[PDB]
UniProtKB/Swiss-Prot annotation:
Protein name: H-2 class I histocompatibility antigen, K-B alpha chain
Keywords associated with the record: Disulfide bond, Glycoprotein, Immunity, Membrane, MHC I, Phosphoprotein, Signal, Transmembrane, Transmembrane helix
Gene behind the chain: H2-K1
Function according to Swiss-Prot or TrEMBL: Involved in the presentation of foreign antigens to the immune system.
Highest taxon in the source lineage: Eukaryota
Segments of this protein annotated with the region Alpha-1: 123-212
UniProt source species: Mus musculus
GO MF annotation terms: peptide antigen binding
Length: 398
């Protein structure tokens, strides 16, 4: 159960100033890949994973031979610890030897759209809420969202852009909670929504910004609990336009304000004793709810799926070749892939991609290294996953 938020601003706006402000935007990183190994003629799923962008508004199109693919599905949007957003776009497809596919992304951080082609060669716990409020002048009321996570597993979601906004279960095990729980969570969310709507208007003034620009307020609120049931860390962090604004310090008593706008909120919260209110929520209410969700999600939550791995071989200009170590279908996402030459790790020359979702709940990752042609048998790939009884060792097999 997410906390009921206290407004960041004093209420009254103004701050005689317009067209005086705006922060850096973050460029999207893109990966295009199939869910399953690509076999010509076999239906598969093609993914376009877009991460690290800010603001949240983004346009994604998937292309087949240069033409827009009409039926492209989009996952709900989320954001990570660094405040940057991520989303997965996917479409069904049956790959062929000669059909080219690509993913095109339009985002304010870039001058023109970016097209990325599909290259098909060869023991604690935490309850955290990720909150997003995005103003959108002209296009309507601000979009407000509350997303809940038990150990990085999304389990509840409230989105104001739904037809009649309501908290929804995102894991089957939350279906146990009765009507009173959902009703109370839904009403608290709508109350929180109003708080952020007012803060959006107020911070617009604190930063002397134009009235027609879209801005974002984000929050990460929650608790990390040790196996002994004791609070390990409490979180109450805010960002404005993707940059730190204010956060409760580890002492659960004082605040760290990132700029002068935030000092106004800090002073306001110190006088009202907001830190004490959060400390109580973080050490009590948050921990109690986390225990209740862990109980209900028991049989589902702890589970792990070890990576199925293998090595692929690819030509490089002249006497060099690339060995690519693949780790597929694993869960959770945490994993380590390394290449060794003579029992020694070659981290400083490996090429790797950020771990990514297959779209079926599992993850994928690969690490590669360039080696002399004919020396492939001198290298070994090591896959360390928490689901592995023992770290895996693989070699290229011809």
């Amino acid at each position: 159960s997410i906390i009921n938020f206290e407004k960041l601003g004093g209420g009254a706006s103004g701050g005689g100033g317009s067209g005086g402000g705006g922060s850096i935007q973050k460029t999207p990183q893109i990966q295009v890949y199939s869910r399953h190994p690509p076999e010509n003629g076999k239906p598969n799923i093609l993914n376009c994973y877009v991460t690290q962008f800010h603001p949240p508004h983004i346009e994604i199109q998937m292309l087949k031979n240069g033409k827009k693919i009409p039926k492209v599905e989009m996952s709900d949007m989320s954001f990570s610890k660094d405040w940057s957003f991520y989303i997965l776009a996917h479409t069904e497809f049956t790959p062929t030897e000669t059909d080219t596919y690509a993913c095109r992304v339009k985002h304010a951080s870039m001058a023109e759209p970016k097209t990325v082609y599909w290259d098909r060669d060869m023991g604690p716990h935490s309850l955290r809420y990720f909150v997003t409020a995005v103003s959108r002048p002209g296009l309507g009321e601000p979009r407000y969202m509350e997303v809940g996570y038990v150990d990085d597993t999304e389990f509840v979601r409230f989105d104001s852009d739904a037809e009649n906004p309501r908290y929804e279960p995102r894991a089957r095990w939350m279906e146990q909670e009765g009507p009173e729980y959902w009703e109370r969570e839904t009403q608290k969310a709508k109350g929180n929504e109003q708080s952020f709507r007012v803060d959006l208007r107020t911070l617009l003034g604190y930063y002397n910004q134009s009235k027609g620009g879209s801005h974002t307020i984000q929050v990460i609120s929650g608790c990390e609990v040790g196996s002994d049931g004791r609070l390990l860390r409490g979180y109450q962090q805010y960002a404005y336009d993707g940059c730190d604004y204010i956060a409760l310090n580890e002492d659960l008593k004082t605040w760290t304000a990132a700029d002068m706008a935030a000092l106004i909120t800090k002073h306001k919260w110190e006088q009202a004793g907001e830190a004490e209110r959060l400390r109580a929520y973080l050490e009590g209410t948050c921990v109690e709810w986390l225990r209740r969700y862990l109980k209900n999600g028991n049989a589902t939550l702890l589970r792990t799926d070890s990576p199925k791995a293998h090595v692929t071989h690819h030509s490089r200009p002249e006497d060099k070749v690339t060995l690519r170590c693949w780790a597929l279908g694993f869960y959770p996402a945490d994993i380590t892939l390394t290449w060794q030459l003579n029992g020694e790790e070659l981290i400083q020359d490996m090429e790797l991609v950020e771990t990514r979702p297959a779209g079926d709940g599992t993850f994928q990752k690969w690490a590669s290294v360039v080696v002399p042609l004919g020396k492939e048998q001198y290298y070994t790939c090591h896959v360390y996953h928490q689901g592995l009884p023992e770290p895996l060792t693989l070699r290229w097999e011809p």
